[PDB]
C-alpha cells in the first residue's frame, strides 16, 4: 500500500495541466497571427488567448494551495508538443483535450480532498466548454466560406 | 465549382484514412484496458461500428467516382483522455464534411455521414461521462498496489 501515490498523481496532473495551458497559449497566439479573412474566428481565438492567460494565473493559485510548483521541463516540453478548415478542427480538438483533462482533474481533486480548488477547476473547464461549443458551431460556416472562396 | 468538389473529395479521402487510424487505435486500446470491463466492452462495440464506418465511406467514395488515397491511408487515464480526443476529432471532421457535402451537392451522402457522426457523438459522450470513474478507479489502484 501507499496512499501517498494518489497525491503524487494529483500533483503530477496539476503540473500537466499547467504545461497544457502553456501549450494552449502558444497555439492560440500562433493561430491568431496567421488567420486572415476570417474575422469572427480570429477574434474568438484572440479572446480565448486572453482567457487562457488568466487560466494559467488560476492554475498557479491551485499549485500554491497544494505547496507545489510548475514543472519547467513539462512547460517546455508541452510548448514543443486546406489550412483554415484543418486549423479550426485542430483548435476544437485541443479544447476537447482540455475538457477531458479538467474533467479528470475534478475527480482527482475530489479524491485527494482538495475541495477548495474544485470551483477554480470548474471555472476553467466552463471556459473550455464555451470555446469548444463556439468552434463546433462555426466550423460549418468556416467550411462554407472556404469552399465559396475556392471557386 | 470543380475546386469545391475537389476539396470535398479530398476530405472524403481524409475521412477514410482517419477511420483506418481509428480502427488501429481502437484495437490497440481494447488490448490495454485491464480494469474497466465496461469501458473495454464499449471500445469493442465501437471498433465494430468503425469497421462498418469504413465500408460506408467506401460506398460514398464509389458513388463519387473517387478512390481512397493510398499514401494518406498507409496510463489508463491518459488513454481514456486520448480516446475521447480522437472521437472529438472525428466529430469535428464529420461536422465539416457535412457542410462540404451540402455545399458540393452530394446530398445523397448526408444521411450516411449524419449516421457516422451520431455514432462518434455517442462514443465521445460515453467516454467523458466515464472519465471520472476511470480516474477514481486508477487512483484507488495506485494506492492498493
Ligand atoms: Cl470568421
Ligand atoms: Fe482552451
Ligand atoms: Fe469513433
Ligand atoms: Mg486552457
Ligand atoms: Mg469513426
Amino acid at each position: 500500500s501507499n496512499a501517498m501515490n494518489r497525491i503524487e498523481h494529483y500533483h503530477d496532473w496539476l503540473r500537466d495541466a499547467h504545461a497544457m495551458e502553456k501549450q494552449a497559449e502558444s497555439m492560440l497566439e500562433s493561430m491568431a497571427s496567421r488567420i486572415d479573412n476570417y474575422p469572427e474566428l480570429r477574434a474568438r481565438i484572440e479572446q480565448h488567448l486572453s482567457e487562457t492567460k488568466n487560466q494559467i494565473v488560476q492554475l498557479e493559485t491551485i499549485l500554491d494551495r497544494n505547496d507545489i510548483s510548475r514543472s519547467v521541463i513539462k512547460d517546455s516540453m508541452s510548448k514543443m508538443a486546406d489550412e483554415i478548415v484543418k486549423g479550426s478542427i485542430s483548435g476544437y480538438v485541443f479544447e476537447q483535450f482540455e475538457i477531458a483533462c479538467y474533467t479528470s482533474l475534478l475527480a482527482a481533486a475530489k479524491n485527494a480532498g482538495d475541495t477548495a480548488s474544485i470551483p477554480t477547476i470548474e471555472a476553467i473547464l466552463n471556459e473550455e466548454k464555451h470555446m469548444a461549443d463556439w468552434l463546433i458551431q462555426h466550423i460549418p460556416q468556416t467550411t462554407e466560406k472556404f469552399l465559396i472562396r475556392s471557386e
Side-chain angles (χ1 to χ4, degrees), chain A residues 1-33 35-78 80-150:
Chain A
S1 246
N2 193 356
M4 189 65 71
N5 290 343
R6 292 192 278 104
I7 312 305
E8 185 178 3
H9 285 305
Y10 177 49
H11 284 179
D12 291 335
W13 296 339
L14 287 175
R15 300 191 193 92
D16 293 337
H18 186 277
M20 177 183 80
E21 294 298 350
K22 299 306 299 215
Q23 174 169 17
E25 169 187 47
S26 174
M27 183 190 298
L28 290 158
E29 290 167 334
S30 178
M31 299 176 76
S33 82
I35 295 166
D36 194 16
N37 287 310
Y38 295 81
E40 301 179 59
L41 175 55
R42 190 171 85 184
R44 185 69 182 85
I45 291 168
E46 293 171 332
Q47 187 52 210
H48 197 57
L49 173 59
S50 297
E51 296 161 335
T52 294
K53 295 182 179 288
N54 184 54
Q55 295 174 359
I56 292 163
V57 172
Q58 289 172 298
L59 287 174
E60 287 163 354
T61 77
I62 298 169
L63 293 166
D64 285 358
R65 194 179 288 116
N66 284 287
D67 291 320
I68 60 174
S69 295
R70 67 196 187 93
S71 171
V72 169
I73 293 166
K74 291 182 167 178
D75 283 352
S76 298
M77 287 307 338
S78 73
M80 309 283 304
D82 240 351
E83 178 147 23
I84 192 80
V85 175
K86 294 297 187 188
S88 297
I89 292 164
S90 291
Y92 176 79
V93 173
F94 195 89
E95 301 300 321
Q96 288 290 357
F97 174 58
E98 304 185 286
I99 288 163
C101 286
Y102 287 120
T103 298
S104 176
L105 197 68
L106 288 174
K110 186 162 180 278
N111 179 276
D114 185 11
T115 301
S117 291
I118 288 177
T120 302
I121 297 162
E122 178 189 31
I124 299 173
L125 170 57
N126 281 342
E127 284 180 352
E128 316 299 18
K129 289 175 175 185
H130 284 291
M131 182 58 167
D133 284 349
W134 195 100
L135 292 168
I136 197 69
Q137 293 172 14
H138 286 77
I139 277 170
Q141 171 194 243
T142 300
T143 300
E144 170 74 356
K145 283 176 169 194
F146 175 79
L147 289 169
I148 287 164
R149 305 176 188 175
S150 74

